[PDB]
């Protein structure tokens, strides 16, 4: 007897901004849901007929929200243990402060040259960096090279994730694990963190997932017929994102991130 072979599979995976655009292509730009008088779908709104379809396709057609600033995914930062913190190898407190407080990260990227001795996450603002360096380096060129030595928020996280060398991560983790072994509570927990980090970095190499997708550049929008509460949270994202692009300031950047976190996962 030859078995009647059936090879069927389904796979989840972290999505890319390009695939989000391919889903939408179709961007929701206005927070208006419906007309107060005519009870018609507002154009470019959460229920736009052009974006989603005539009033079957409205159950499946997706949209997206073009966020001015990248926002981290709450599942991959705030859930314990943090995946972003483990892959970046930093304590959760400093990452949360970088995302939620007025903290700036020194040396966020490596694959481009720098010229400063700024390391770590300096909580206080650098006095020289406020006036001295920008006033000597003017504005246009300074902003051109600005996002290479000091940055803040989820943009710094995305920059750190994008330029990560996973193989170097695996090798450093393995050598540190060997050093720890060749030498008793967190002498083991540090080892367990190291084992968890190489297994996390190994999975990225063999898959098509990118660790920078853990910070969102676009926000997919649920089809309208599935949300005839969720609508209110979608307006807030547009409410605070459209405010942010009008400015272009740090406080509004945090407000957009909190709107996405509440929409994605509250009570966390």
């Amino acid at each position: 007897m030859i078995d009647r072979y059936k090879h069927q599979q389904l796979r989840i995976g972290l999505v890319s901004p390009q695939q989000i655009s391919a889903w939408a292509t179709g961007e929701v730009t206005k927070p208006y849901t419906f007309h107060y008088k005519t009870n018609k779908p507002e154009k470019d709104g959460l229920f736009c007929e052009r974006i989603f379809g005539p009033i079957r396709i409205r159950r499946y057609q997706m949209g997206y929200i073009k966020l001015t600033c990248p926002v981290t995914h709450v599942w991959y930062l705030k859930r314990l243990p943090s995946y972003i913190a483990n892959l970046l190898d930093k304590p959760l407190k400093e990452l949360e402060g970088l995302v939620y407080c007025d903290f700036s990260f020194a040396r966020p990227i490596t694959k481009k040259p720098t010229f400063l001795r700024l390391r770590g996450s300096f909580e206080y603002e650098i006095q020289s960096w406020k006036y001295s360096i920008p006033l000597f380096f003017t504005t246009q060129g300074f902003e051109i090279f600005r996002n290479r030595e000091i940055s803040t928020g989820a943009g710094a996280i995305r920059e750190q994730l994008a330029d990560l060398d996973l193989r170097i991560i695996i090798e450093n983790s393995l050598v540190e694990w060997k050093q720890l072994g060749e030498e008793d509570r967190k002498i083991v927990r540090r080892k367990d963190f190291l084992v968890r980090r190489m297994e996390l970095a190994k999975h990225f190499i063999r898959t098509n997932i990118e660790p920078e997708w853990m910070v969102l550049c676009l926000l997919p929008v649920l089809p309208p017929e599935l949300r005839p509460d969720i609508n209110e949270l979608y307006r807030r994202v547009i409410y605070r994102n459209n405010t942010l692009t009008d400015l272009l300031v740090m406080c509004q950047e945090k407000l957009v991130q909190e709107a996405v976190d509440t929409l994605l996962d509250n009570g966390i």
């Binding site: 010229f115 001795r117 700024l118 650098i126 380096f137 051109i144």
Partner: protein, 220 residues
């Protein structure tokens, strides 16, 4: 040789090469003076022979230390990229590195082609940058590098010292920048003027800008 220099003087200088021009200037060793303890000149030499000639000419003017800024274009002159950086390293103490006109070609690859003449690459240089330490050359010289000419020449101007000298080359009297396909407007003389204008505050603000990385006061 010196046709531009001769015509301007006839219609109306540093080194012994310009002395014969007087006996018989925009983009030809245009001195940039802002009451500093050094000098800044601009030359159009984008060729190894002319660059070598001028770099030899600087030595005869008795400079205490030699600092040079060099670059190369993209999609062209691919067969002689490392020679300028080789001669600059063998003729100058601390040499800044950048591009001349990257064009469509990515400037990072050309800047890698710079270090090929010394036994380095962008990978090794950037690993040096991560460890915030740059061991000197074989002949005791120093090497620093930056992708964009802007901050590179700003730091070079900030590194003008007493009896010292800084060369920025590759552009000359041309006042355009070639990135991708758009010819951006960029003047080396005016940018050097601006850098010389406001050099004081960067050094007096507690920042030891003497070398990469700068020893910031609160960064240790």
């Amino acid at each position: 040789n010196g046709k531009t220099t001769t015509t301007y003087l006839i219609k109306s200088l540093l080194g012994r090469h310009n002395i014969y021009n007087i006996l018989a200037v925009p983009g030809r060793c245009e001195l940039i003076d802002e009451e500093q303890a050094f000098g800044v000149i601009v030359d159009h030499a984008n060729t190894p022979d002319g660059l070598s000639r001028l770099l030899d000419s600087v030595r005869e003017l008795k400079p205490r230390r030699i600092i040079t800024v060099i670059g190369c274009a993209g999609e062209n002159e691919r067969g002689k990229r490392p020679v300028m950086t080789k001669i600059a390293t063998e003729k100058s103490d601390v040499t800044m590195l950048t591009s001349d006109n990257p064009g469509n070609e990515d400037p990072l690859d050309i800047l890698d082609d710079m270090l090929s003449g010394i036994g380095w690459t962008m990978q090794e240089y950037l690993k040096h940058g991560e460890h915030d330490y740059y061991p000197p050359l074989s002949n005791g010289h120093r090497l620093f590098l930056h992708d964009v000419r802007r901050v590179a020449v700003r730091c070079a101007v900030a590194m003008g010292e007493e009896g010292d000298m800084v060369v920025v080359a590759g552009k000359g009297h041309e006042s355009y920048q070639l990135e991708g396909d758009k010819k951006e407007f960029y003047d080396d003389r005016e940018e050097c003027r601006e850098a010389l204008q406001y050099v004081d505050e960067l050094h007096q603000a507690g920042i030891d800008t003497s070398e990469f990385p700068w020893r910031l006061p609160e960064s240790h």
